[PDB]
């Protein structure tokens, strides 16, 4: 069996949601995402694994006075996109990069209703920024930046002690992409990985070291 969805406040207007699922061979695994409050409204940064936990997530904030304005997925794997079907069925706007949407369609998965492209996209100007560092954990992976808090949600790109599942990874590009990410957000106060503890900007340096190391290993 699986632990309940957890929601804990991380900072002002910023929550970490952790959901869990059973994976063959691994057992129970965790996945972190964020909910960001913009005034009277809430944005999901990644959905939980399932429809059912996305609804519990959504409900928790609706019940506390926050309309769900939208939801953005950092990449196509179902630890970021599992709730997109449910959200869409509720007319809650979902966002993903054009690259993410291709990879969802290609796997027979429901796509985000809205898409964006390129390096920098404002989901909410001056409050929620999406950045594309280049291929790494997946071809499509992006990170989300909360400039008012200097909080970076890094998703499954942020891999300080081992790169994780390499099946969709781009090992030759990841050092590049990690270097760009480090240069751009070295002033982050908090960096939030998908599968490990929140840390500071040093997670950016360790991820770059890991990607280099992974690229060295493959030879
Ligand atoms: C100490 C420790 C050891 C392992 C992990 C871990 C393994 N995870 C995992 C493994 C296989 C598949 C998936 C599903 P995804 O690829 O994320 O869509 C997730 N997820 N977290 C965490 C902490
Ligand atoms: C101290 C410590 C120990 C372990 C970790 C850790 C394990 N991670 C992991 C391993 C295998 C699979 C996956 C899922 P994904 O790559 O997203 O497909 C994630 N990710 N971080 C971090 C810190
Ligand atoms: Zn992934
Ligand atoms: Zn993952």
TrEMBL record:
<feature type="binding site">
    <location>
        <position position="32"/>
    </location>
    <ligand>
        <name>Zn(2+) 1</name>
    </ligand>
</feature>
<dbReference type="GO" id="GO:0017001">
    <property type="term" value="P:antibiotic catabolic process"/>
</dbReference>
<keyword id="KW-0378">Hydrolase</keyword>
<feature type="binding site">
    <location>
        <position position="75"/>
    </location>
    <ligand>
        <name>Zn(2+) 2</name>
    </ligand>
</feature>
<feature type="binding site">
    <location>
        <position position="77"/>
    </location>
    <ligand>
        <name>Zn(2+) 2</name>
    </ligand>
</feature>
<comment type="subunit">
    <text>Monomer.</text>
</comment>
<feature type="binding site">
    <location>
        <position position="79"/>
    </location>
    <ligand>
        <name>Zn(2+) 3</name>
    </ligand>
</feature>
<feature type="binding site">
    <location>
        <position position="195"/>
    </location>
    <ligand>
        <name>Zn(2+) 3</name>
    </ligand>
</feature>
<dbReference type="InterPro" id="IPR058199">
    <property type="entry name" value="BlaB//VIM/IMP-1"/>
</dbReference>
<keyword id="KW-0046">Antibiotic resistance</keyword>
<dbReference type="Pfam" id="PF00753">
    <property type="entry name" value="Lactamase_B"/>
</dbReference>
<protein>
    <recommendedName>
        <fullName>Beta-lactamase</fullName>
        <ecNumber>3.5.2.6</ecNumber>
    </recommendedName>
</protein>
<dbReference type="GO" id="GO:0046677">
    <property type="term" value="P:response to antibiotic"/>
</dbReference>
<feature type="binding site">
    <location>
        <position position="79"/>
    </location>
    <ligand>
        <name>Zn(2+) 2</name>
    </ligand>
</feature>
<dbReference type="GO" id="GO:0008270">
    <property type="term" value="F:zinc ion binding"/>
</dbReference>
<keyword id="KW-0574">Periplasm</keyword>
<feature type="domain" description="Metallo-beta-lactamase">
    <location>
        <begin position="32"/>
        <end position="195"/>
    </location>
</feature>
<feature type="binding site">
    <location>
        <position position="137"/>
    </location>
    <ligand>
        <name>Zn(2+) 2</name>
    </ligand>
</feature>
<dbReference type="InterPro" id="IPR001018">
    <property type="entry name" value="Beta-lactamase_class-B_CS"/>
</dbReference>
<keyword id="KW-0479">Metal-binding</keyword>
<comment type="similarity">
    <text>Belongs to the metallo-beta-lactamase superfamily. Class-B beta-lactamase family.</text>
</comment>
<dbReference type="InterPro" id="IPR036866">
    <property type="entry name" value="RibonucZ/Hydroxyglut_hydro"/>
</dbReference>
<keyword id="KW-0862">Zinc</keyword>
<dbReference type="InterPro" id="IPR050855">
    <property type="entry name" value="NDM-1-like"/>
</dbReference>
<dbReference type="GO" id="GO:0008800">
    <property type="term" value="F:beta-lactamase activity"/>
</dbReference>
<feature type="binding site">
    <location>
        <position position="156"/>
    </location>
    <ligand>
        <name>Zn(2+) 3</name>
    </ligand>
</feature>
<feature type="binding site">
    <location>
        <position position="197"/>
    </location>
    <ligand>
        <name>Zn(2+) 1</name>
    </ligand>
</feature>
<keyword id="KW-0614">Plasmid</keyword>
<dbReference type="InterPro" id="IPR001279">
    <property type="entry name" value="Metallo-B-lactamas"/>
</dbReference>
<dbReference type="GO" id="GO:0042597">
    <property type="term" value="C:periplasmic space"/>
</dbReference>
<keyword id="KW-0732">Signal</keyword>
């Amino acid at each position: 069996s699986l632990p309940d969805l957890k929601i804990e406040k991380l900072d002002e207007g910023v929550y970490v949601h952790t959901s869990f699922e059973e994976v063959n061979g691994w057992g129970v695994v965790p996945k972190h995402g964020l909910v960001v409050l913009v005034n009277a409204e809430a944005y999901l940064i990644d959905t939980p694994f399932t429809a059912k936990d996305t609804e519990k997530l959504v409900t928790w904030f609706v019940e506390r006075g926050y309309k769900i304005k939208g939801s953005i997925s950092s990449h196509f794997h179902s630890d970021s996109t599992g709730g997109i079907e449910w959200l869409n069925s509720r007319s809650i706007p979902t966002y993903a990069s054009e690259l993410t949407n291709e990879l969802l369609k290609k796997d027979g998965k429901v796509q985000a209703t809205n898409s964006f492209s390129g390096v920098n996209y404002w989901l909410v100007k001056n409050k929620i920024e999406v950045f594309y560092p280049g291929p790494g954990h997946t071809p499509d992976n992006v990170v989300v930046w909360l400039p008012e808090r200097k909080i970076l949600f890094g998703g499954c790109f942020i891999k300080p002690y081992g790169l994780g599942n390499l099946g969709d990874a781009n090992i030759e590009a990841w050092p590049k992409s990690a270097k760009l990410l480090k240069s751009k957000y070295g002033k982050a106060k908090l960096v939030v990985p998908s599968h490990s503890e929140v840390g500071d900007a040093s997670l950016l340096k360790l991820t770059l070291e890991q990607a280099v190391k992974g690229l060295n290993e493959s030879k």
